[model samples]
Target chain A: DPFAGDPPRHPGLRVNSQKPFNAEPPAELLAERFLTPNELFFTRNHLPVPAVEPSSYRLRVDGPGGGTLSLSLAELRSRFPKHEVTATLQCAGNRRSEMSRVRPVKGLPWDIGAISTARWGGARLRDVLLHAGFPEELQGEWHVCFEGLDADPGGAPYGASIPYGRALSPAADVLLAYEMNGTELPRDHGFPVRVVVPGVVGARSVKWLRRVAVSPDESPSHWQQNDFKGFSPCVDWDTVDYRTAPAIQELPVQSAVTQPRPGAAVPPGELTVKGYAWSGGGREVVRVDVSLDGGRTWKVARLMGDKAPPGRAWAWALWELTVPVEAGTELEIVCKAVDSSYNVQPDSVAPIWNLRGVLSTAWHRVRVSVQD
Target chain B: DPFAGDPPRHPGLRVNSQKPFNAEPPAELLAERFLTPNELFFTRNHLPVPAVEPSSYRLRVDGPGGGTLSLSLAELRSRFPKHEVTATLQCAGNRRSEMSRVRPVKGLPWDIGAISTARWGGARLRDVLLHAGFPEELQGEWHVCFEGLDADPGGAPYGASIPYGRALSPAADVLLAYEMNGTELPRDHGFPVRVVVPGVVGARSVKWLRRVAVSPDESPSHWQQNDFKGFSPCVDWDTVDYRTAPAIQELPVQSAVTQPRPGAAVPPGELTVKGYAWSGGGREVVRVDVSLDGGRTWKVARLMGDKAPPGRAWAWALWELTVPVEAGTELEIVCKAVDSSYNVQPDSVAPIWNLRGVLSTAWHRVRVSVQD
Candidate 1:
């Protein structure tokens, strides 16, 4: 079952698949703090953690027009000046469960916990590229592809890519992360190194990162070519076109209600609600609105957490609002957030529910009876 | 103080200004039905009605390359096929009163009733543009500026402009409207005809429209050159520069809680919530979420109204939901809505409130007590 060398796991996580060690923390534990615990952070491995002896581990860099730069783990750490990125990482399939209820979809049945925020420390990807003799003025259009050491059985290594500009943009905050939550990155995460791509989907943030390449086209891997795009609800496997939609780079505006435990019976009056709000592409969570009584009314939730800079909101904002509930009533609690660019969740799920079940950030709802 | 030579006006609408006849319907008047009655429709005017004998009315269209096309009211009526468009028109200053609470802003102190929906009958602007000398294959950037007959006393005539593409795009539904709700257009509204820019700021609709000019830049009038643009909440009149922000075009996602008046008391029982949601750019109000427990929880309200074609939804949607309330407690009722494009209200009023008191579409909130 262990696929050769599986890393030690967290007992508290709600396991979804044991073979690849895929799991998410309980929903209630999600909003307990600003930064998720290392072991408690959701683990979404596509393959078992590859056993990499740090002394022998080498990172290879492939540049456009040929040539490569190879460095051992020791040289990689000693050379580049460190950078810190307080960023939230989310899977493309983070809230797939909600989509499944609207219609049967194909994917891992992930609950809402497939997201976590962390403070990642590493060398800026821009610095690494410059050190590898990257062209300063060569502008013929290109994409930066990342290949991870983890691979499916008999399949190619897991791979993804970002536009060359996005990887080099000052606002992008792309990094080769050596630490998570201010500590040596755990083995379950990529130990020794991983890519921390701020303000982007987690797919391109390759773990156990081993190789980087620059090319005119996107990745040839299945994940980048066909998987993480969104489609109209009408499109299905029979009529779906893979090359139509662009790969998700910066994610849209998103938020979720994380407390209340879904069915916890609470005595009416004086209840607290909590959740996290985030947006990709360097947008800040300007506001979060919470509602009870089926969205008939709303109250502004106070946002709290470690604050990032103006255009670098790498950290997710924690929001809390206290409300009084009526007794003997079954109320639906809801939360929707807005980013600095004023992006919000679509009101319903059916319209955005794609066959792949990606980008499922509709308004999150939880129902519980207000006990007498 | 109805201005001299004013058109026959509605007896019931609450008037906010005497000289220009600015008014909004009662709050309860809105949620009663989806389409607002033309007579009771909220009227916003900057000047007294212009006396235009319909038989002698002429519309002048000036093109960019130095040619003009003029049409009599009779010629415009018979030239193009009449099309029907049902759309909602809202003053950019609709919820101006709410913005004043954060900081004082100049404009009509409009309540939520400044929005009205009507079935418009007219020739599509595209059809008329092609019938005139407008180039069938013009290869240049242009903006269509409209000048209304209603002019402030000795001040610049109220004017605005939209991208020429917006006027000709099939999905835009821009109409040179001649009728309102199956009847001859009222005198208070544009009588002979008006430019009804569906899914745009009300100012761009240009009531009593008389001229259409194609130019490279926006109108230089005070309404366009100096006012109606938004600003950061911190930028007061003391430091504002209207040149910086783009003219208000398609409005942001907006909604208002309309039923169960703000101070209305309730004996312990099921409480009903009602509201209207609308967006510009023809995006539909896909969902309305209501909350009675100060937004800690919410429920989806049932959407009610005539549906429009996909991507051309220019009308507002009315929504309703019911929830139980407890006696001996105070409740803060709030409601928020989402547009098809995933647009939403900001959490609080102050953050988005403008100096002109425009675009005040934060969460609509009201507080009342539940009693035994």
Candidate 2:
């Protein structure tokens, strides 16, 4: 089988699916270590994991000036200065399980563990593009397409695209990544090299990097053009048209409860609540409010993590809040995050639900029973 | 009087205060023209309007290298290429009145009209900085401080600072503007020149631009330090500290109803609702949901105006929705906007209320009576 050569994974992950190997770490374990260990990090794949030989891997770049240049893994590491950026990559369907309970929608039933942060080491995409003599004037009119070697039986590869201006700008920390968490990238996490587009959706950061094409049009892949866009809550599978909505890029402000799993019984007295908060487009998470009585009253959680510079905050803020609870009672613990722009999460998911079950950010709530 | 030379007033404006010239156009009149007339544009002044002579005007740039360069108005015009950007400017207290009603908060009670959009023409701030011998390496550590000619009683000028990286980046669209809506700026609105920091808080765009200082520290002006920051709703006047929060830069996603002036009677049958939706940080307003029954059900509104490039959406989206109403009934009309990041406004004001009455971006609701 093509998947027989796939890298070994931690047995601790909560398996959501087996065939394509989609899994996430236990919620409580997520906040234990700020930078999740590679073994415990979530794995999301769409097709059989292809084993890539590092010696033969080549990254093809098709510049806006109509020149195609090829660079090996060794060249990518040696030709450019190595830069490290700590960024959190999140699947679009991170909290779809909660959304699924609200209403039946299509896609993987993920439970808020699909996001994790890592210190990525790579060469800047802008430097590589500049080295290829990309015309600066055409940035506003072009799109940068990313293609990966991982593919389905039909031989089509996983692909996506982002605006060329984003790739060309110095502020955007887009990278041709070769290392993750101080180690060479693992097989399942894009073996030789991957594209890491910080502050954007994880899908745009194509793994098993192969080819990058610059064109006036976006990538024509099914994932880019049809699968990842959003629609009104009223839009459904029967009447859904992906062309009507733009592809999901930077995500909205998002937060979720990670400790005291739903329905778990805990001893009365002080209860500690923990979670992670993040906002896309480098907007910093300024505050996280925790509520034990369903948002009527709130307490600010203490945030700990990298305090990134303005407009470059790419990592998540792990937060903790301790509150007193009464015995023999059930409490609905809720949390919401506020970004530097003051963008807050929606109160509920029904308002933002889509047929594709993406962008499910809402006030994360967990109901737990307090023991006598 | 210090204000003797102030420009003639627009009789159509709704003056919130007259001394410092704080006023805004009528809500209904605001939506009539996509680009508000120069006279009718919201004027938010903190001091007497300064009178500047075009013949003697000089823009001073203090570079990071401790060198100061001065250029005359004519030199400024002729030295650099002119560029125009259509942007929306909004006060931090745009909807302070709504927050005040929820609970008394300090600040002017501004209605929903404290925002307006215009096409600004100017020399790029980045170009001017580069010409003044600004070191590229200092971009990460320096702050760009803008000081206006307009000063307070003690001779302290209104000043604010943004990060040097933002000012020096090509994508920021910061400008040393001389024209608004194709005309030389009026005295009331920064006559000779102004700093236009698009997609940031209007307070950061100092008027009557005089000095641009590049420093390691931010501007120490009261407005930049002791004001324009947000706090928890529970923190009130007696216990509030501005130092705890960073100064407001890019604002949150905001929208408000502009038509059917609250409590006005409208004819039964079809009622047309109009409003403006905008998000800071150049995040686009992708969708706006309107509800006549207090947000229980929603209808999507049609958005119009300039469709800006990704992350460059400085202009607001003017939206309109037509819905049926029953005669002899009172309706609580509401509207909320979703930005490119899918960031939606809070459902109510109480959760986001602050002692300063800033960032009061809740779902805009207006109660109107339907006539028989």
Candidate 3:
């Protein structure tokens, strides 16, 4: 089988897709610690991993206009100062399955675990781009596009782009990553080189990054031009005009309950609820509100996380709350979070769900059965 | 002079309009405590206060289909069990002055203090409606309208309406208020009686409220039919269409920095930042993120508040952050908040700002000069 060469993954991960390699860690284990382990980290891949020799690997950088520069894998590590920062990677399609429950949508049906956090060691994209003859003038600047080595059956290479404002932002912390969780990048994860665009959707963080280019427009890749765009709740596939909305660079506030198993029965006494919350575009998740009795009342959960570096915090906040309860109760537990920019998840999926089921950061609710 | 006829005012409050009584507390005092004081709570009125004798005051309650029932002030207080809730009341145009920085807008030039919180004591709108014959059948139900006793030229009274889902929601907490703080409602504020719709905009809580009508359509008054509505960013006076946009109901998440006033000088060491965040609906504010060094970094502020009633936390969250900083640094301090639904403020003001300057909850910013 063409998929026979897939890398070994953690057994605990809840699989979303098999061929393209998408999975999330189990709910309990995800909330177990602040930083998820490399093996247990969720994987969201668009294509099979390419076998590239570390010594032979080179990152191609294209200019503001035309000139090209090739950076060897060794040079990518040694040429620029190694900058390490912690951030969370979330698929735009994360929790897409929940959106599907609201309406029919096109794309992989992912659950809550399509997000994980790690310490990324990388060279700042700005430092390298400036050294590679990127234009100094910002007047005509627009987007920074990336191309991955992974390919399909004659389809375009995995590609994506971020807006100029974020790309050029001094605080953006966009990275050309060479390491994940303190070691060399693994094959399942991006190996040799990748773009860890902090506070952006995981899709924009291209794996096996082989090329970089600056342009006056967004990436011409299908992923950038046609896909990864937002639409009105009423805009179905038939009426979707991709040009009307810009590609999503930042995600809205999002959170979910993690530890409690959905539909699992519990002998009620003191029930503990655990979860995580995150926001995109460098905004930090500040608070997580948890409800034990179907949101009739809410208690602020205790949040714990390592402080993110200057201007960039792309990490999920681990939250926990314990409350006393009784048996014979059908508890509808829900959680919602807020971010640095005061961004929040919509109350219902119907208002924010789209044709693609992307950006589904509505309030996450789970019903649990309690035994008498 | 119309200003001569205004009610005696609180000397500490900063006045915006003298005649109709528009004022807000100073910035720093706002977030110093959780529940704002009645004497200091911001007041906004469209017209001069009308003196109505409590004995003669009557509230007209209309049914789901027909019949009119008039309940006296004594009956309104004596009938249904009195319910008291602490919720924030904010004008839809709370941050209009900030919106003006983006583009020219039509109405009130309000500063940040247009929002305040108080303990509201009243009879449940649901209980009264049911007593006065509100049909329980949910289908075909539309809106419950309220008309103010105060009138404009030629007797056009201010009016507004709320959908049936909210008016009858057990968790909605809509009220026909007879008390503010702990006493009878003050004159400038609603006197003998007023409609205090929790979690919805203040405009919907009509002051000097005398008439209540339930109908399939919204209130056909200037305030409800035309004025209090939202519009797209591109919309201006020339191309304005009130019919296209629905009347403002539950407001989105909103917050503002209250301490370390913008462009103020500070002696830095341990700098403390304070602010308030709130959402219009019963949605509680979950978290608030404060940034130093222009959002290159952010820290979660400590939130202080009481747990709201079941699905009915219509209160403000007071947040404070004390962080170490160096002197001689020009800081562009900012804050943004999240509600129970994880709703966040948009990054910029222009996109969401309207011709009427409503719902402008952008990231609250203050540029402070820290010196040795």
Candidate 4:
């Protein structure tokens, strides 16, 4: 079993899938860390988490033309300049439970655990592609495909693709990460090396890296070809056709509250609210506005911490705001975030809910009473 | 079985409780109708959808201050002046899906469908209370308890209670509804007479009228005392003590999209979006804002059609807005609603995700590509 030496099961987990080891940490634990601890980070593995030997690992690269090149883990480190990136990795299934409210959708009922941020260290994918024989003339070939060691019973491997320009652009922050949070990769997290496609869905960040193919087409894996696509609210299982929609790449701006937990009572005085916010594809989180009286009035939240690595701020930006609570009455505390792209959350769940409950980025609201 | 006579089963259904036939509609269909269509309206039953003859129906009232008083359906209509109310009925489980996301909580995965609005016609519960010899001194009583004909194996029937002041307040709009949407009540709905406790949860709106009891305490039903309550997001199943929370009543403001469904492609041109906005109790929907260019810009939607009733606007208000779409570009259509009290939706699902997935009022965002 790929989970042979996995850590003991968390007593707080609500297991959804046991084989690939996907479980959400209890909500209370979620507020404890802005960047979820690696052990508690939500995992979404189509196949089992494979154990690989770093010493024997070899990554092959197939150029857009006909040439092919291979590099071992030591060769990759010795040949390419090491790069570090701080970015947030979010599963397309993050906030899926919110979508279940809009309409009946299929798939796991993932909560906010589907997202986490970490400092990643690796060789730049741009440098690797150029060194492997990538040609400047293939600029128009917009996709770079990656393959993993994990495969299904039918021999189909787990794979995904990122935009070509994004892979080559220094600003894109794409990396073949070998370390997470300054530490060597854990066994469950693709030990030797993995492509960290910052600001994109976790599915695109291929794990257990083995091969890279520069091409114009998307990856042929099930994760890219069939799943991770958005659908219509009216599209039920009977009428849903996955091919109608394109795969999800860049994520929308999103934010969530970490304190004052829902259904919690607030003392009759000033209350401070805290949370984290992030956006996809290098879009910086510019601001987060909170509303204690629903949307009637708004207050700007103070940004906490430093800016993440240039071009690869994968981790979330924590924010907080304090507001006075009216005595002898209940109030609804609400919040929404905006990215450098100025994307804000919607106000209701009915429109955004999908069959699988994926990508539920609505405004976060909580109701509480102010006791005397 | 109550579900036997229904139309073809929805393949998307996640069956929770099947015996009494309690089921919620898919999340996407929730905003389609301001007043949920009778067939699609969510059904919550403690017992079977009983087959009852309207001619033999009788409602009895008995309590500490009153003797047993019985009245036939005919007498209910003829003896007392008929009153009508456009009220919304929301199950305590309406937003259960949101709850499930917060923690590993237990309960049905009800979507927003657990709530619906309709015009109800019937005699007043106040009139019945007065006719049953309710003493003026009983005005100070804290609760008005009600019992249904349906019972469990132990003979404990479905029962609940509301504050005496709320039940009798002219502003509360509580009614003994026998007609829905200008037609006789459907079998699934309470026929002959059912209490329409507007602003309160559907569970408190007891069906199949049997007896009314005025008391100083809440009903002894497990649902009333243990369920239908809100709790701190920090509270988990193991550490939970139901006594800490109060039963939920009078939902906060809510809204959703009904047109230009998610992943639906729009031909190159101007695109029009439509949706519905509503609030529980007598609270009115004040405004709905639509965003075509993400949240960078917003247009106020025009509230179309007639309002439901005076202080009884039970149905949602449909609103529409049109915006030009940039040719060949995909647009992320977003919407948020504000009630008279200015309650708005949340931006993400993580902070508000509860164990039951209930009350997911996040902003609604839909992505659509424009094809030439």
- The prediction achieving the highest DockQ against the true structure is 2
Which candidate would rank higher by DockQ, 1 or 4? 1
Whichever of 3 and 4 has more DockQ, that candidate is 3
For residue B230, give model 1's deviation from the true position in Å. 1.3
**TM-score: which candidate is best?**
2
lDDT agreement of model 1 with the native: 0.80
| Winner on TM-score (1 vs 4) | 1
Best-to-worst ranking by DockQ: 2, 3, 1, 4
> What is the per-residue lDDT of model 4 for residues B33-149, given as tens digits with 9 covering 90 to 100?
656666666777767555567788778777555567778989988888888877667765655665555455566666455667778898888877777766533533477888887
Candidate order by TM-score, highest to lowest?
2, 1, 3, 4
- Number of the candidate with higher TM-score, 2 or 3: 2
Shift of residue A117 alpha carbon in model 2, Å = 1.3
Off by over 4 Å in 2: A1-6, A63-68, A131-139, B1-5, B53-57, B63-67, B136-139, B326-330
* Ranking according to lDDT, highest score first: 2, 1, 3, 4
Q: Model 1, range A58-124, lDDT digits (tens) per residue? A: 9999765588798787776779988888889988899899999999999888998989988899888
TM-score, first chain, each model: 0.97, 0.98, 0.95, 0.91
How do the candidates score on chain B by TM-score? 0.95, 0.98, 0.96, 0.86
C-alpha lDDT values of all predictions: 0.80, 0.88, 0.79, 0.71
* lDDT per residue as tens, model 3, A1-372: 656776788777788788988888887788787878999888888888777889888899987568789999889888999988788898888889999997788888888888899889989888888898665446644778899988888957999987655665455778889899999888878898889988878889988999988887778999888888665554677877787555676666789988797897878788888899987756666567777666555666887886564226677888888888788888889887756433445456654557898878867889997789
Say which prediction, candidate 3 or candidate 4, comes out ahead on TM-score.
3
How good is model 1 by TM-score? 0.58
